[PDB]
């Protein structure tokens, strides 16, 4: 069916220009039976409706009040995408941004209940600079558990996997914690039968795209 | 329409409204913006939904013409059956068509009534602080920001604002 | 033909949800009421502009 | 100079309805309620297959016409279907007293 | 503009039990209301719109009702996957959201402790972690013990969301200290107390073996 | 309603009026008092009485299902009779229900029309000597006693009264 | 009427208008004169013509009672036929009478709507340059000749005319 795939840099300097772009597949951004909204969710404010575009005879832009004159949404039929452009970003914008397709109607009129969503883009604003993560092994003790400690990176998020995604069962990926130094850190653990401690190789795969860092670390028990 | 709002003293409909059949378009220093008067749209949606349900359930015992076979020397009773079923189907077609036509009429006029009533709701608050520009717009004689417009929308406009 | 429907007319089946229809008088099933009309449209919106 | 304006929804639609005082009124969104399509296939009813008498009349089936050996044993049915003018009929001529009344009784079995 | 309230602000029930949420809108617009589900880390997912109509693909165990100012969302038999934050929206504004929590039987965790790696010993800092796996409820208390001396203010912990299959929690507690201060100590132990345990469980190791 | 008076630009009805469906509530130095606009109430009463008489006399030849007995070998004609009477009773039930519904609609809207027309009658006399307070009331810019109100009621308000 | 124009806030109809159901009667220094608002009259004429065509063509398959003769021992089937035809003719008489009544209602109210809408069309242009005399007339606060009246008729009144 329909798919909305988001993109845009997760780090944006204060007072600068934030720019996200939601690419559409499965419909037309020039559809006469839908509208395209931008939503933001933060633990402080919850879900807030930011903006909307659509096309009936001209291109129509419907913005919110909390972003009066501060937001602009565009639709490009040449790529079948629509774009969020937010000026003068401040610390209050740190949130997860979703592009949605408002398009379940009731007697032809669109109620705005969002119908499809993009996988969301976390966006933080700060004076800090990007920092690549360091990945450290967590070896099983001599039924067994092992894992990875990712330390000293910025900003969120970070993607972690095991054996290029081959291992799914028993994996636990932890919500990161902000360190006093202003840096992020978390851990990823997995439990396995101890019998496979010597025969099964466990490769930890980490990706931090703002730093463009991709690291694979084999974790073995400590010998001596 | 029958009340004169649609295609009348208001010229035509806004392509830029997508979330309601009726609404406002406010323009002040804080910009311009469309808003849907949800409550009146819900009255209209209930109207139409109940109308569709009425149409479906009011003719839920219409007539079912079951076939009866007759021989060659029962032409009279066969013709009785034939024209009986024919007449019942004709009268029920008549009923369905009349319901459809009269409901289209009443529904279009209901929408016209709603637009005129919304214009009147705005005017009855704005009584003298504003002036009618004759096509559905109201010129404010004072300066009033977005919360003024919100108070007008939800129906709590406070008349003490000095206006000269 | 090897189908399965919930109404049957001497000239086809009706896999439909509308309240009326105009295929053929004699049916069997949980299917709509016969009508001798060629169009039954109901207005939900409002006059266009 | 602030100003507020009241208007109503519209679109690029063309769906037309009829009124008792006016024909071919164009509205925004309208709901058709009349069905006009069939598939043309004698399809099952609630899963239980019909009894499609291929070329036999009801009388032929009941009496057991030799050219009707298709229907020596019938499973349960949902509705009996026969052609307008069957050709396999009372092959030896004659009549079937109160034929139509037995048809009526069949309509309930 | 319009203000929504949502009740309760949180709840807890077991599998199979019927739960109900209430969204009170200051306005009566029956349809325009819509209930979304949000699992941790994923976008919302429209469950109900027009307050009584169901979106295609949603299990029938959800049902919206109500009118006037009070709308309700009823789940007839919970699931380990229904654990989530439920939101109600009124045409452009979302309610604060309620947290549907899975109540189950108590579970004893598996406790592991992982010492600082020599690579971190190069860095000048030492970080030990205590991992607590597959337990319930959220209630769990951890003690850090070095040379039988109690620690405070030098550790911090983070728990995961309630699991989607068996509805248990999991936790990491990080004790980070200077490497010389680490070398001044020998014994390091993590001590867990929990309703899931009949006795406090201590796991301990010594620096260097 | 369809015209916007009842439960509209007039908030609600007066419990204190008992002798008319519509009326006035005047308040001057000579006190306050309700009065019934009898003529409009009589128009409405005639409307409803003629509607009831129409309902009674328009279906005074409906259908009377007399019983006919048949033997065991007249199942076809018996079923013909049975479904004929059934269909006639169904169609006449349909007619009765439609009449009742459509008349309820027209009657509620008739009352709304009458209230709006009375408000308009008062306004069209009081044109500039008074001001609309937006909820059905009119503020007099001059001093006018009970005979002023009576002239407004019976419809003879004399516009030459100096009003500043 | 239902909208209050005919036999309402306008007293009665003009004998001097012969070429339209609605119209204007302008009086300035260039004389007095009646004019017919043709467009609204054409809307009304189309309304009535389509109504008559609907009445004729909606009951163009009513029921035709063909005579069937029966013997003395077919009293049951004869009575079946008799009361069947009787019932069909009764129900179709009912349908014809209801259509006639409801259309008379809707047509009278349509004319009332048209008169009120024309008065409103004039008022919405003349907004402040004129004053309502309460019975359908508008007093011009400026001097305006026959082309002023023509611009009012065809709907292009230009508001910038100084009016004190």
Describe the structure.
- This is part of a larger assembly, with 1 copy of chain A (224 residues), 3 copies of chain B (164 residues), 2 copies of chain C and 1 copy of chain E (209 residues).
- Chain A contains no helices and 19 strands.
- Chain A is mainly β and 224 residues long.
- In chain A, strands 2, 4, 5, 6, 9, 10 and 11 form a 7-stranded mixed β-sheet that branches. In chain A, strands 12, 13, 15, 16 and 17 form a 5-stranded antiparallel β-sheet that branches.
- Chain B is an alpha+beta fold and 164 residues long.
- Chain B is 52% helix and 12% strand.
- Chain B contains 4 helices and 4 strands.
- The longest helix of chain B has 51 residues.
- Chain C is an all-beta fold.
- In chain C, the strands form 2 sheets. A 3-stranded antiparallel β-sheet of chain C has the order 2-1-4, with no helix packed on it. A two-stranded parallel sheet of chain C has the order 3-5.
- Helix content of chain C is 0%, strand content 29%.
- Chain C contains no helices and 6 strands.
- With 209 residues, chain E is mainly beta.
- In chain E, strands 2-10-9-4-5-6 form a 6-stranded mixed β-sheet, with no helix packed on it. In chain E, strands 1-3-8-7 form a 4-stranded antiparallel β-sheet, with no helix packed on it.
- In chain E, a hairpin with a 2-residue loop joins strand 7 and strand 8.
- The radius of gyration of chain E is 23 Å and the shape is elongated.
- Classes of the chains: A mainly beta (224), B alpha+beta (164), C mainly beta (49), E mainly beta (209).
- Chains A and E meet through strand 5, strand 9, strand 10, strand 12 and strand 13 of A and strand 5, strand 11, strand 12 and strand 16 of E.
- Strand 6 of chain C pairs antiparallel with strand 4 of chain D, so a sheet runs across the interface.
| Number of E-state strands of chain A | 19
Quaternary class: part of a larger assembly
How far apart the termini of chain B lie comes to 36 Å
The fraction of residues in strands of chain B falls at 5-15%
What is the ordering of alpha helices and beta strands of chain B? HEEHHEEH
Q: Using only CA atoms, what is the Rg of chain B?
A: 26 Å
Largest sheet of chain B: 2 strands, antiparallel
Q: State the distance separating the first and last CA atoms of chain A.
A: 55 Å
Structural class based on helices, strands and sheet pairing of chain B: alpha+beta
Shape of chain A: elongated
Using only CA atoms, what is the Rg of chain A?
A: 21 Å
Coiled coil (chains B, F, G): 56-90
Disulfide bonds (chains B, F, G): 144-148
Subunit structure (chains B, F, G): Homotrimer of disulfide-linked HA1-HA2.
GO biological process, one term (chains B, F, G): virion attachment to host cell
């Amino acid at each position: 069916q329909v798919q909305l795939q988001q993109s845009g840099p997760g780090l944006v300097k204060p007072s600068q220009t934030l720019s996200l772009t939601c690419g559409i597949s499965g419909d037309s951004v020039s559809s006469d039976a839908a509208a395209w909204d931008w939503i933001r969710q933060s633990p402080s404010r919850g879900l807030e409706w930011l903006g909307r575009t659509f096309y009936r005879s001209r291109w129509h832009h419907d913005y919110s009040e909390s972003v009066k004159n501060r937001i602009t949404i565009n639709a490009d039929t040449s790529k079948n995408q629509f774009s969020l452009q937010l000026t003068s970003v401040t610390p209050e914008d740190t949130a997860t941004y979703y592009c949605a397709r408002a398009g379940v109607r009731v007697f032809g009129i669109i109620v705005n209940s969002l119908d499809y969503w993009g996988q969301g883009t976390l966006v933080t604003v700060s004076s800090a600079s990007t920092k690549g993560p360091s990945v450290f092994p967590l070896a099983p003790s001599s039924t067994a558990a092992l894992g990875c400690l990712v330390k000293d990176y910025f900003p969120e998020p970070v993607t972690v996997s095991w054996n290029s995604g081959a291992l799914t069962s028993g994996v636990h990926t932890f919500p990161a914690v902000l360190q006093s130094s202003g840096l992020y850190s978390l851990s990823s653990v997995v439990t396995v039968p101890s019998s496979s401690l010597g025969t099964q190789t466990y490769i930890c795969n980490v990706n931090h795209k703002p730093s463009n860092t991709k690291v694979d670390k084999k974790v073995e028990p400590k010998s001596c | 329409g029958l009340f004169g709002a649609i295609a009348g003293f208001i010229e035509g409909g806004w392509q830029g409204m997508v979330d309601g059949w009726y609404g406002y378009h406010h323009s002040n220093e804080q910009g311009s913006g469309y808003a849907a008067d949800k409550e009146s749209t819900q009255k209209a949606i209930d109207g139409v939904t109940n109308k569709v349900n009425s149409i479906i359930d009011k003719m839920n015992t219409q007539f079912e013409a079951v076939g009866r076979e007759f021989n060659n020397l029962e032409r009279r009773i066969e013709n009785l059956n034939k024209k009986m079923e024919d007449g019942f189907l004709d009268v029920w077609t008549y009923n369905a068509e009349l319901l459809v036509l009269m409901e289209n009429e009443r529904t279009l006029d209901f929408h016209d009534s709603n637009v005129k009533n919304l214009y009147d709701k705005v005017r009855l608050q704005l009584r003298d602080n504003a002036k009618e520009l004759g096509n559905g717009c109201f010129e404010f004689y004072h300066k009033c920001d977005n919360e003024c417009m919100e108070s007008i929308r939800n129906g709590t406009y406070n008349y003490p604002q000095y206006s000269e | 033909g090897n189908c399965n429907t919930k109404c049957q007319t001497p000239m086809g089946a009706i896999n439909s949800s509308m309240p009326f229809h105009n295929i053929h008088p004699l049916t069997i099933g949980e299917c709509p009421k016969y009508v001798k009309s060629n169009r039954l449209v109901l207005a939900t919106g409002l006059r266009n502009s | 100079q602030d100003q507020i304006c009241i208007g109503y929804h519209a679109n690029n639609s063309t769906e037309q309805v009829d009124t008792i005082m006016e024909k071919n009124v164009t509205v925004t969104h309208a709901q058709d309620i009349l069905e006009k399509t069939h598939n043309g296939k004698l399809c099952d009813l609630d899963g239980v297959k019909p009894l499609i008498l291929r070329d036999c009349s009801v009388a032929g089936w009941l009496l057991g016409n030799p050219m009707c050996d298709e229907f020596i044993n019938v499973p349960e049915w949902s509705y009996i279907v026969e052609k307008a003018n069957p050709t396999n009929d009372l092959c030896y001529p004659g009549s079937f007293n109160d034929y139509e009344e037995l048809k009526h009784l069949l309509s309930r079995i | 503009a319009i203000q929504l309230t949502q009740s309760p602000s949180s709840l807890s029930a077991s599998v199979g039990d019927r739960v109900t949420i209430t969204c009170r809108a200051s306005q009566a617009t029956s349809s325009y209301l819509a209930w979304y589900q949000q699992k941790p880390g994923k976008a919302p997912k429209l469950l109900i719109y027009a307050a009584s109509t169901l979106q295609s693909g949603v299990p029938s165990r959800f049902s919206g009702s109500g009118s006037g100012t009070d709308f309700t969302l009823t789940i007839t038999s919970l699931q380990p996957e229904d654990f989530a934050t439920y939101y109600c929206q009124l045409s452009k504004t979302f309610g604060p959201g309620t947290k549907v929590e899975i109540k189950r039987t108590v579970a004893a965790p598996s406790v592991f402790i992982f010492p600082p790696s020599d690579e971190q010993l190069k860095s000048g800092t030492a970080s030990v972690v205590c991992l607590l796996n597959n337990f319930y409820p959220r209630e769990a208390k951890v003690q850090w013990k070095v040379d039988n001396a109690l620690q405070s203010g030098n550790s911090q912990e983070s728990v995961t969301e309630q699991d989607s299959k068996d509805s248990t929690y999991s936790l990491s507690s990080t004790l980070t200290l200077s490497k010389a201060d680490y070398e001044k100590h020998k014994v390091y132990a993590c001590e867990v107390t929990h309703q899931g345990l009949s006795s406090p469980v201590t796991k301990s190791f010594n620096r260097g073996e």
